[PDB]
């Protein structure tokens, strides 16, 4: 963490400084200042212990802060989240007996590198032809966030099992959290006592609704959702579910029940689903040939999927094209020439306070030094109104 | 569409998201010294001129680096002046082993006997890695090639 460093802790620096200061202590009586000379054994031996001791001495303040964050407010040490989808199994024929797809049934994509396992046993009653069950990814990570019908290959054959396919794009793949995310998670525990501000409300609603969801709290916003008509005593919540879609009414009801015993008596709580604005990107860039065109496209797509994460986006805030260009270029190995969002080069303002961006399509036109033009197009969402 | 919700007194969804802060005394810098040596296993000596914690750790515990235990048994900062005539509690050698507590802890793999004590005694007993089995030391080197970020 960004804690001040008490003393200099470095092997080579310790050797050099220990020779120079030995020269200084005597009135120039010791002149072997050569950091790699004949005094290197003595100085290096002393500096080995010096560094292995000062390295631990420099950790005192961070150790105290970590002990505070661990003991008095236990905080789980989050490691990651596994992506989940909904598989559908379809049988070859109508059976006279009830089919059973066992727990931990392995399915995979066409490449065979991404593997999902069924949560529990699936019982398809006799006479039925299809049955759905949830599946979880093999490992944590954002690479398991696949599209619909992207997982259809299965190794173990079952009798009369015709097909299997994921009917829901797998979501909530997370490789872990950074130090600042854990800091925010710890600090919200410090200050959520009595949800009063916009921030406070949102953090509470994101809890108890899942990890990978979003909330937007607006004060004095009535049922008409018109800003110019403020209604004192009204708090409007706008929700995006764990799947990245506008919140289902059951989730709305759950969050309402959760927040009911926490709002000020006499105040009115309104909850409605959030709205999504689709972002279509067109990139014309020059490649330095340090990566292949496919590798560049994959890296840019991954960076943009990180950028347009609803956890990384503030609802109602305009999307800045310079920020998008910086996120694209942070991939490296390319030079941006032109970028279009929604058929323009200008910043995209959200229509209202509760609209979240959601980038859907991106076209690549990558040119290298030799003059090869690589053109590609990627659609990331299943449909406009998803 | 908007659903209206009004202040309730107590739901069952207030039990859903409930405790956020859990006071836990797990292993941290302020919990190294939770366990204490019994008073019956100590010696109540007096501080005399020419005395040091090195001498006390040498005579009594046979090891010069054992002084951390003695200070940890007395709550004193070693570099602070221990006045002449002040009393100290020196741990015994043979009676330091009964200050180590034995707990059977459960696990999905299986129940394990675990030794817990103040960290100074744990380091002194495990000096030279004699107590730990070779499998643990081999495991610590299973991850050998450490990934670093280029900057």
């Amino acid at each position: 963490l960004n804690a001040p460093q008490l003393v200099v802790d470095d092997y080579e620096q310790l050797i050099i400084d220990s020779l120079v200061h030995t020269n200084v202590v005597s009135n120039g009586e010791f002149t072997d200042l050569d950091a790699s000379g004949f005094m290197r054994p003595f100085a290096g031996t002393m500096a080995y212990a010096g560094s292995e001791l000062l390295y631990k001495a420099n950790l005192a303040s961070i150790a105290a802060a970590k002990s505070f964050f661990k003991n008095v407010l236990g905080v789980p040490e989050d490691t990651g989240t596994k992506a989940t989808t909904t598989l559908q199994f379809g049988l070859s024929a109508s059976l006279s007996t009830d089919f059973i797809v066992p727990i931990n049934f392995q399915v995979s994509d066409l490449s065979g590198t991404l593997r999902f396992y069924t949560i529990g046993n699936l019982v398809i009653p006799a006479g039925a032809t299809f049955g759905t069950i949830e599946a979880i990814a093999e490992d944590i990570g954002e690479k398991y966030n696949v599209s619909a019908n992207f997982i259809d290959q299965y190794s173990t054959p079952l009798t009369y099992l015709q097909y299997v396919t994921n009917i829901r794009p797998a979501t909530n793949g997370r490789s872990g959290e950074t130090i600042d995310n854990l800091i925010e998670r710890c600090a919200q525990i410090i200050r959520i006592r009595n949800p009063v501000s916009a921030l406070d409300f949102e953090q509470l609603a994101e809890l108890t609704m899942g990890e990978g969801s979003r909330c937007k709290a607006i004060g004095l916003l009535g049922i008409n959702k018109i800003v110019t008509d403020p209604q004192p005593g009204v708090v409007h919540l706008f929700l995006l579910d764990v799947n990245g879609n506008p919140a289902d009414p059951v989730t709305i009801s759950t969050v309402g029940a959760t927040l009911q015993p926490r709002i000020m008596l006499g105040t009115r709580l309104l909850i409605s689903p959030m709205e999504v604005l689709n972002i279509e990107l067109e990139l014309i860039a020059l490649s330095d040939s340090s990566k292949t065109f496919q590798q560049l496209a994959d890296d840019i797509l991954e960076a943009l999927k990180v950028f347009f994460n609803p956890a990384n986006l503030t609802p109602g805030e305009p999307v800045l094209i310079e920020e998008v260009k910086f996120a694209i270029r942070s991939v490296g190995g390319l030079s941006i020439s032109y970028l279009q969002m929604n058929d323009n080069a200008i910043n995209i303002p959200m229509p209202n306070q509760w609209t979240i961006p959601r980038f859907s399509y991106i076209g690549f036109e990558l040119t290298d030094s030799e003059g090869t033009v690589y053109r590609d197009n990627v659609v990331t969402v299943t449909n406009p109104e998803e | 569409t908007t659903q209206e919700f009004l202040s309730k007194n107590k739901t069952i969804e207030s039990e859903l998201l409930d405790l956020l802060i859990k006071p836990n005394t797990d292993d941290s810098i302020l919990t190294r010294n939770k366990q204490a040596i019994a008073d019956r296993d100590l010696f109540d000596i007096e501080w005399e001129p020419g005395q040091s914690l090195n001498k006390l750790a040498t005579e009594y515990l046979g090891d010069s680096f054992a002084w951390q235990i003695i200070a940890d048994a007395n709550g004193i900062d070693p570099t602070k002046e221990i006045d002449i005539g002040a009393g100290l509690k020196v741990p015994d050698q043979k009676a330091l082993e009964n200050s180590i507590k034995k707990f059977i802890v459960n696990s999905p793999t299986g129940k394990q006997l675990i030794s817990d004590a103040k960290q100074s005694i744990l380091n002194l007993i495990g000096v030279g890695d004699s107590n730990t089995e070779f499998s643990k030391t081999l495991k610590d080197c299973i991850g050998k090639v450490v990934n670093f970020s280029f900057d």
Partner: peptide, 29 residues
């Protein structure tokens, strides 16, 4: 003298409806 011999070991540690049915006759009663 009583002598004890113990042999011990360590275990390893960890659709809407059916398709077709025969025709039925229904009689209101």
């Amino acid at each position: 003298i009583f002598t004890s011999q113990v042999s011990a070991y360590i275990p390893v540690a960890p659709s809407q409806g059916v398709g077709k049915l025969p025709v039925y006759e229904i009689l209101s009663y």
